[PDB]
């Protein structure tokens, strides 16, 4: 299970999930809604996957948590055009994440 020293990450993730721009990223990208995603994106990531990994002890360090957060946003900008609704949401969420991370680092 998660070590208590990572509680600050648990909180950041909770706040990200609650953000107005988080809706694209809550669950894995869904093949029922778009084709050819895993064809291009080799390491899919989403906030529910992160939440369960963090709670079960799958992240030893805050750096691993942050790398998965950035992977969400990196995948988003790889797959989606900046002008799309999902693309714009990824940019909002990256800024929000970086602002919360910078309080600690
Ligand atoms: C399919 C487009 C997409 C969504 C997306 C579209 S709709 C949604 C949330 N939506 C809520 C209602 C549920 N019934 C189904 C899922 N996420 N997200 C991401 C990260 C996408 C891509 C291609 O990068
Ligand atoms: C979440 C609804 C949805 C969208 C979608 C994309 S864009 C949009 C409207 N809208 C614009 C501004 C945002 N702040 C919130 C959502 N709904 N696509 C798909 C395939 C959906 C489902 C039900 O599967």
Curated annotation (Swiss-Prot):
Expressed at moderate levels in most tissues analyzed, including heart, brain, placenta, lung, skeletal muscle, kidney and pancreas. It is found in: Nucleus, Nucleolus. Residues 3-104 form the Bromo domain. Deacetylation by SIRT1 in late S phase enhances pRNA-binding, allowing de novo DNA methylation and heterochromatin formation. Acetylation is high during S phase and declines to background levels in late S phase when the silent copies of rRNA genes are replicated. Ubiquitinated. Deubiquitinated by USP21 leading to its stabilization. It comes from the Eukaryota. Component of the NoRC-1 ISWI chromatin remodeling complex at least composed of SMARCA1 and BAZ2A/TIP5, which regulates the spacing of histone octamers on the DNA template to facilitate access to DNA. Within the NoRC-1 ISWI chromatin remodeling complex interacts with SMARCA1; the interaction is direct. Component of the NoRC-5 ISWI chromatin remodeling complex (also called the NoRC nucleolar-remodeling complex), at least composed of SMARCA5/SNF2H and BAZ2A/TIP5, which regulates the spacing of histone octamers on the DNA template to facilitate access to DNA. Regulatory subunit of the ATP-dependent NoRC-1 and NoRC-5 ISWI chromatin remodeling complexes, which form ordered nucleosome arrays on chromatin and facilitate access to DNA during DNA-templated processes such as DNA replication, transcription, and repair. Both complexes regulate the spacing of nucleosomes along the chromatin and have the ability to slide mononucleosomes to the center of a DNA template. Directly stimulates the ATPase activity of SMARCA5 in the NoRC-5 ISWI chromatin remodeling complex. Belongs to the WAL family. The bromo domain and the PHD-type zinc finger recognize and bind histone H4 acetylated on 'Lys-16' (H4K16ac). These 2 domains play a central role in the recruitment of chromatin silencing proteins such as DNMT1, DNMT3B and HDAC1. This is Bromodomain adjacent to zinc finger domain protein 2A. It comes from Homo sapiens (Human). The gene is BAZ2A. The chain holds residues 1796 to 1898 of 1905 of the full protein.
């Amino acid at each position: 299970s998660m070590h208590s020293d990572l509680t600050f990450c648990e909180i950041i993730l909770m706040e990200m999930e609650s953000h107005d721009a988080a809706w694209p990223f809550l669950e894995p990208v869904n093949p029922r809604l778009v084709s050819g995603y895993r064809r291009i994106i080799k390491n899919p990531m989403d906030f529910s996957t992160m939440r369960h990994r963090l709670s079960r002890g799958g992240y030893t360090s805050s750096e691993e948590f942050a790398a998965d957060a950035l992977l969400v946003f990196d995948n988003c900008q790889t797959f989606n055009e900046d002008d799309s609704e999902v693309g714009k949401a990824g940019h909002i969420m990256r800024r929000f994440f970086e602002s919360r991370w910078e309080e600690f680092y």
